[PDB]
Design a protein around this ligand. Sequence first.
Ligand SMILES: Nc1ncnc2c1ncn2[C@@H]1O[C@H](COP(=O)(O)OP(=O)(O)O)[C@@H](O)[C@H]1O
Ligand SMILES: [Ca+2]
Ligand SMILES: [Ca+2]
Length: 364
Amino acid sequence: DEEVAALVVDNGSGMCKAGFAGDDAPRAVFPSIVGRPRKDSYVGDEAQSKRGILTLKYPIEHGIVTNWDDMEKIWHHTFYNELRVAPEEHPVLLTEAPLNPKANREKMTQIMFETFNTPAMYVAIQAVLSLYASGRTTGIVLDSGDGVSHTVPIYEGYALPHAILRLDLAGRDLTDYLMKILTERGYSFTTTEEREIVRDIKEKLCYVALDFEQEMATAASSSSLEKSYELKDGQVITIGNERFRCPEALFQPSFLGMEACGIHETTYNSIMKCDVDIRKDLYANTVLSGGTTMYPGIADRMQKEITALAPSTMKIKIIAPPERKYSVWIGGSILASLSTFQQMWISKQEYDESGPSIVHRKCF
Ligand SMILES: Nc1ncnc2c1ncn2[C@@H]1O[C@H](COP(=O)(O)OP(=O)(O)O)[C@@H](O)[C@H]1O
Ligand SMILES: [Ca+2]
Ligand SMILES: [Ca+2]
């Protein structure tokens, strides 16, 4: 091979995924955190491990970069610590959130070429990459991560900004809600350490009920839905209706005091904002992505809820890839490996010729 490996970096609100184009999975995943004492800067797992003696910062808390000084440190960490490569020696494909401000796109571009001296780079919308990973160029993606969720209609490879909806309800909120209801049950999960334990309980024992009320009735009259969970100190606790009550908040945000529409309604509203001529393509190609869409039963629940909102004559299909937790990264690996994509990279030459604003033309 003549070309060096290209890098794929998925910038997540909670976890960053990094690896090499062509691979089937990211080589590294770490917390999008930077910490400094209350070694001068700590990034990733280490910052989390030593959080006790540090003040943590979340530079991309809700999907959008808010502090470029710390984001630069996360990227430095990604190259030198996680992937152990020199960025000046490899093209880099970066991901961005839907509705990312134009100025931010230019900033990312300038930093890659001027700070890291990348030989080439490109930036793609997360939702679009997930759709690519599913083998489609048209459809609507419901991306629910750690700090944010989005419904992104995509037609012929292009996201439709006017129809994109943002929901400030995701994995983080669900974890805290589970801590709250488990505490109401009689336990006590309130500390940061306990938040990590509940996050684990959430990822392992929660599920989306097909019918909330029926599930609540079953849990109230029997122990058939109860599951045991063992804490590190040996204590075994019981999780009952909390298993499905937690993710139910995605469909009924009021449980969290939020007036926002649930994910099914948000998906429907995005589709309705699109040209009537492509709505059927979206209904027939609703793809789920992100860690928060991993709950067992979520696909069937979405199918049921969307069917209730859409015309009776509409064909509804929910696609839930088993590997959807990393579909963004995988889509990037696929894209960066495409023969026709090689001409699309922004080269250092092109950057020197046109400057940061070239990103709008090259990465439309
Ligand atoms: N199996 C699972 N069930 C439910 N939630 C999960 C599961 N696996 C991961 N999560 C949650 O998904 C979120 C992270 O997903 P991710 O798409 O990586 O987000 P981001 O890109 O914003 O960091 C976290 O809140 C995590 O707890
Ligand atoms: Ca993400
Ligand atoms: Ca409501």
